[PDB]
Write a protein that binds this DNA or RNA. Sequence first.
DNA 1: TAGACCTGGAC
DNA 2: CGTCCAGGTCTA
Length: 310
Amino acid sequence: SEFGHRTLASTPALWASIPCPRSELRLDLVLPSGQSFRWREQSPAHWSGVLADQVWTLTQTEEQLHCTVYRSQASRPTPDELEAVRKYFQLDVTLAQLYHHWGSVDSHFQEVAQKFQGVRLLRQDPIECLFSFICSSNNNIARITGMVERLCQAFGPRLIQLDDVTYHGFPSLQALAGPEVEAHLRKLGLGYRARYVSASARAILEEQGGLAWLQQLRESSYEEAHKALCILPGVGTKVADCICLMALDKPQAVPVDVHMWHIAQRDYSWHPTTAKGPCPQTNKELGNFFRSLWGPYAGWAFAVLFSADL
DNA sequence: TAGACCTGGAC
DNA sequence: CGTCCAGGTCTA
Ligand SMILES: [Ca+2]
Ligand SMILES: [Ca+2]
């Protein structure tokens, strides 16, 4: 009881709720769907990971999101900590209102969405998001997930251990910008991305002004933020869009990848107007198409289709 | 605008 | 067992 990952049943007194119907959130459709790679369903229906520098286990009932934190002296989460959870899930943003708007302007969205509710965007930490996706280029969720964990185990601060799992906080810029980081990352299997991580860490601290420069992007415009991001090695148009969408508060950002193309072609008979294949210009066009169709929160809209495809 | 590219399940 | 493919990016 006192050990291992908790469950709602095992330690009732250590949990606290946040009103939240499954219609507004589905942990199982959000946490493992390629937004964040830090959560694992350690026991059925319970998800554990690092959120706001601490470890949490989350699980949900029909109307409640149950939370528990592992900071000593175990106790339920405090209202402020819970606030950190609400912020992470952007619970002030109402999915029902978004699904409704999207559905009214797109019959296809209407269909699919009725079977995949509660898909929303996580508000991620800029650093974690930047380097997580630096690792995602030309790669799959399973691998990316492993790489990211190895990364944090090797360069992130040790937080706490549960069962045989040791949680780590995400690596700081300083640690990632350190000597021989690349060589160490290659031994960990990040492939050529190993250089990207190192180079982008150095690029930020040594040529852009450090952490501040990145955080500033949240107040910056989507177009600005996206442009800024693109100078960093390993970060192309797609990765940048993922970051603007998931960390820089750019909900109109639409990351186009092979997934997006297939769906665009199959479900909307979409084809390039202004090349006939996947390239900078055609990708830019596809993103505008979905933006013109769905509106200001097109990015959220695509997540519904992206994490509903299979 | 065509490959070159780390890695490991899936074909 | 060689060939693909994954939330692509980068370069003659
Ligand atoms: Ca591909
Ligand atoms: Ca770049």
